[model samples]
Target: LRLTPLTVLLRSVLDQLQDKDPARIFAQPVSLKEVPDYLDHIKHPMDFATMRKRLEAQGYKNLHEFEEDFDLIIDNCMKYNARDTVFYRAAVRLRDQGGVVLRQARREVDSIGLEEA
Candidate 1:
């Protein structure tokens, strides 16, 4: 939350997102040890930790990019995992409920803004 500007909105956004995700699947990357095909399958790997890495390092241009990255996490999972799997089901849940947070944040982001020093 160093930026204090961009961080304020996004921090709130991620907080809601995290709480919604009970299994915490988005917290870290899919382990290559667990799923050897993970890296190969997920072409655009995006996780909460990496999103934080970018947030903390000021890698994101704005909140829109953040939304895009978060959306990718869902898309990547849905793309790789079968519809019958827990991961896929979780992603669908996230896609449905978590999407509201993203949308809410997206609108709030523009009003308040993203880049900061």
Candidate 2:
């Protein structure tokens, strides 16, 4: 849910947190309503309705488990210059909550020392 010019910076945040606490609030399954808030700063922004449609088009079912593959998507978006504040804020929120967010996962590998598994 977050997009920043500093891709490495974001990934660093993820790396610092990912391995530190496995007992996060979102370490398990959660709900869409349980989502978090992202930073309101980015170059590309994806709205709720638009994001929903995009996810559907991609054949994503859960619509809630987007966290599973967040890193890949966000990296791609950053490559294409589609990241924005709304998305950033959304990601930040989910990340801070301990439950992984779609946007947060996206930057997992690019943020810090950790790479996608």
Candidate 3:
């Protein structure tokens, strides 16, 4: 299947991480007191395809730098919540994989532009 940043994040957190407790990762973006609500609100979607397409539309450069920052943040989060170690470790790999297509496409376009010059 085609991959996007969100897909990578979800797959990393859900499938690869092997962490049965979804709350820790899902609640990362939510407030401490709101975790219960957040978990309750989380559900499956109508179309993963649509969601993935939307995610693919978003763009970013220098994924390596972003990855470094992601590592730092996840490390800090792990420090705070030791139970999330598995997820964090999986994330480090999948998050880096997420941007592969985008980076390759960008590099190809750069080379094409140079060829035409």
TM-score for all models, in order of appearance: 0.85, 0.23, 0.30
Give residue 23's error in model 3 in angstroms.
Answer: 16
Worst 10 residues of 1 by lDDT: 108-117
lDDT of 1 by residue, 12-77 (tens): 887788888888988898788888888777788888888877777777777878888889989999
Report backbone clashes per prediction: 0, 24, 0
Taken over the whole model, the C-alpha lDDT of each candidate is: 0.83, 0.39, 0.41
Cα lDDT tens digits for candidate 2, 16-110? 44443343432233333543322233333333333334443553443244343443334323443334655344445444553443346455435
- Whose TM-score is greatest here? 1
- Return whichever of 1 and 2 wins on lDDT: 1
Task: Tell how far residue 82 is off in model 1, in angstroms.
Answer: 0.5
Q: Point out the higher-scoring one by lDDT: 2 or 3.
A: 3
> With candidate 2 superimposed using the best TM-score fit, by how many Å does residue 38's alpha carbon deviate from the native?
15
Q: Which stretches of candidate 3 lie over 4 Å from their true place?
A: 1-51, 55-84, 98-103, 115-117
The true-versus-predicted C-alpha distance at residue 52 of model 3, in Å, is 2.7
